[PDB]
């Protein structure tokens, strides 16, 4: 009944992606990490194709489209993990075929990072984050990436406003009970930014340790000067 943009972001939402961990390979920290890094690489391919559907995004310069994605890709990834995990408890649904509980995490040396992601999960759980709000938030995070190297500053600000308006539209027509819901949603972006840069740093260290293999795209995003 509400926003055309929100409806459009709902249709553009990608189909499920799977982790596909090798049933034959025995479990270990490298199996898990190699798995997560493979899932991420494929995810990124999808994410980039998705961004083109965000209204006004593909009209920016190629350099700008790249700067936004280079700065927000991990936030878009984390948001997806968070949303898929709303219906669970103390577990992170990286994919339908790869759900990590506490132990699984400790063994992969990802306890701290995942606990951070669970902080996010907890907040959205209490707010009862709806799919419509989820897709709009992803687009907003991408647009509000805070990249240093932006060309057309005004065009990016306009993009942020367009998406921000769609979020207001949804919250006013669908959540009259809480006139402050849009703001509460926006107030969750900071923790998303925090957790994301932390995740990006952790996987860069894994990259340097060289014990875990990663594909070119996932590597390229980690490398990127952001």
């Amino acid at each position: 009944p509400y926003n055309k943009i929100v409806s459009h972001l709902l249709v553009a939402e990608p189909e499920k992606i799977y982790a596909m961990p090798d049933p034959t390979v025995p479990d270990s920290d490298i199996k898990a990490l190699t798995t997560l890094c493979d899932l991420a690489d494929r995810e990124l391919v999808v994410i980039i194709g998705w961004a083109k559907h965000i209204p006004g995004f593909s009209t920016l310069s190629l350099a700008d489209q790249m700067s936004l994605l280079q700065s927000a890709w991990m936030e878009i990834l984390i948001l997806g993990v968070v949303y898929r995990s709303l219906s669970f408890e103390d577990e992170l649904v990286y994919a339908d075929d790869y759900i990590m509980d506490e132990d699984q995490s400790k063994l992969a040396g990802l306890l701290d990072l995942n606990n951070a992601i669970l902080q996010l999960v907890k907040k959205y759980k209490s707010m009862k984050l709806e799919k419509e709000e989820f897709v709009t938030l992803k687009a907003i995070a991408l647009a509000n990436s805070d990249s240093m190297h932006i060309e057309d500053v005004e065009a990016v600000q306009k993009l942020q406003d367009v998406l921000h308006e769609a979020l207001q539209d949804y919250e006013a027509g669908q959540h009259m009970e809480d006139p402050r819901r849009a703001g509460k949603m926006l107030m969750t972006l900071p923790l998303l930014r925090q957790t994301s840069t932390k995740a990006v740093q952790h996987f860069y260290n894994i990259k340097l340790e060289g014990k875990v293999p990663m594909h070119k795209l996932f590597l390229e995003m980690l490398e990127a000067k952001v």
Partner: peptide
Amino acid sequence: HKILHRLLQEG
């Protein structure tokens, strides 16, 4: 930044 540029330009 070549893969990103490529996947984006493709469309």
